[PDB]
Amino acid sequence: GMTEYKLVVVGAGGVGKSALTIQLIQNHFVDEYDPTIEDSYRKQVVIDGETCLLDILDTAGQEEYSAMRDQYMRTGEGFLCVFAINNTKSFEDIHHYREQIKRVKDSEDVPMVLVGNKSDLPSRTVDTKQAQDLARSYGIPFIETSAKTRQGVDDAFYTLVREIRKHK
Ligand SMILES: CN1CCC[C@H]1COc1nccc(-c2noc([C@@]3(C)CCCc4sc(N)c(C#N)c43)n2)n1
Ligand SMILES: Nc1nc2c(ncn2[C@@H]2O[C@H](COP(=O)(O)OP(=O)(O)O)[C@@H](O)[C@H]2O)c(=O)[nH]1
Ligand SMILES: [Mg+2]
């Protein structure tokens, strides 16, 4: 049977979670997508010759630490922690998202990838070295992406699938 992978995209508002997810689903750059819409989207993909079913949850809205929201996030098997390379605050928030994932999954080894988005822009404020060194502190991969140009989009999602496969 075809394996389904439940992936969750997290990070500050405005980093490009929706743009990244829609590039994967539609193969098109969407510069405008209602910042309040949180929803899930499926796509069949060939990753290393195997057709698998991705189920991507694109998160949005206010932080809520209810038993219901924890249960909803606990459905994720792997997480993309996204920041924007021209927004220092989004990068400085990443540790919070990682700590919340570790708590809900009750595990120090949850499949995760650090994503530096907006790599097409010239306004960089977060050095690639600092981002690579944060992923090294966590023991996870780092991928540079652009939802505008498609840079790194399959690398981010497919690497997360490969981290889930090794975790099982
Ligand atoms: C002063 N703040 C703290 C630093 C940044 C600043 C603002 O932080 C901020 N803003 C919005 C959302 C979040 C946020 N953190 O984790 C989560 C998720 C979705 C991640 C996945 C695992 C869980 S489990 C659960 N219940 C969640 C929820 N709501 C989550 N989202 N953080
Ligand atoms: N140049 C550029 N802008 C992007 C990129 N990804 C998203 N954006 C823009 O960043 C803003 C926020 O994007 P959105 O996908 O709504 O972020 P979300 O709140 O994390 O879902 C919008 O103005 C998008 O056009 C990218 O890689 N490059
Ligand atoms: Mg969004």
From Swiss-Prot:
Q: Which GO terms describe its cellular component?
A: cytoplasm; cytoplasmic side of plasma membrane; cytosol; endoplasmic reticulum membrane; focal adhesion; Golgi membrane; membrane; mitochondrial outer membrane
Q: Where would I find glycosylation on this chain? A: 36
Query: Where is the PTM N-acetylmethionine found along the chain?
Result: 2
What catalytic activity is recorded? GTP + H2O = GDP + phosphate + H(+)
Q: Which UniProt keywords apply?
A: Acetylation, Cardiomyopathy, Cell membrane, Cytoplasm, Deafness, Disease variant, Ectodermal dysplasia, Glycoprotein, GTP-binding, Hydrolase, Intellectual disability, Isopeptide bond, Lipoprotein, Membrane, Methylation, Nucleotide-binding, Palmitate, Prenylation, Proto-oncogene, Ubl conjugation
UniProt keyword annotation of Transferase present: no
User: Reported effect of changing residue 147 to T?
Assistant: In OES; somatic mutation; also found in colorectal cancer samples
Phenotype upon changing residue 35 to L = In NS3; characterized by a defective GTPase-activating protein sensitivity and a strongly reduced interaction with effectors
The record gives the effect of mutating residue 61 to R as: In CFC2; characterized by a defective GTPase-activating protein sensitivity and a strongly reduced interaction with effectors
Q: Where in the cell is it found?
A: Cell membrane; Endomembrane system; Cytoplasm, Cytosol
Q: What is the effect of changing residue 62 to R?
A: In a colorectal cancer sample; somatic mutation; promotes interaction with SHOC2 and PP1C
**Gene Ontology MF terms:** G protein activity; GDP binding; GMP binding; GTP binding; GTPase activity; identical protein binding; LRR domain binding; protein-containing complex binding
Which positions bear N6-acetyllysine? 105
Report the record's Gene Ontology biological process terms.
Answer: actin cytoskeleton organization; cardiac muscle cell proliferation; cytokine-mediated signaling pathway; epithelial tube branching involved in lung morphogenesis; female pregnancy; forebrain astrocyte development; gene expression; glial cell proliferation
Positions bearing N-acetylthreonine: 3
What the entry says about post-translational processing?
Acetylation at Lys-105 prevents interaction with guanine nucleotide exchange factors (GEFs).
Similarity section: Belongs to the small GTPase superfamily. Ras family.
Involvement in disease: Leukemia, acute myelogenous: A subtype of acute leukemia, a cancer of the white blood cells. AML is a malignant disease of bone marrow characterized by maturational arrest of hematopoietic precursors at an early stage of development. Clonal expansion of myeloid blasts occurs in bone marrow, blood, and other tissue. Myelogenous leukemias develop from changes in cells that normally produce neutrophils, basophils, eosinophils and monocytes. Leukemia, juvenile myelomonocytic: An aggressive pediatric myelodysplastic syndrome/myeloproliferative disorder characterized by malignant transformation in the hematopoietic stem cell compartment with proliferation of differentiated progeny. Patients have splenomegaly, enlarged lymph nodes, rashes, and hemorrhages.
Q: What name does the UniProt record give this protein?
A: GTPase KRas
Which taxonomic lineage does the organism of this UniProt entry have?
Answer: Eukaryota, Metazoa, Chordata, Craniata, Vertebrata
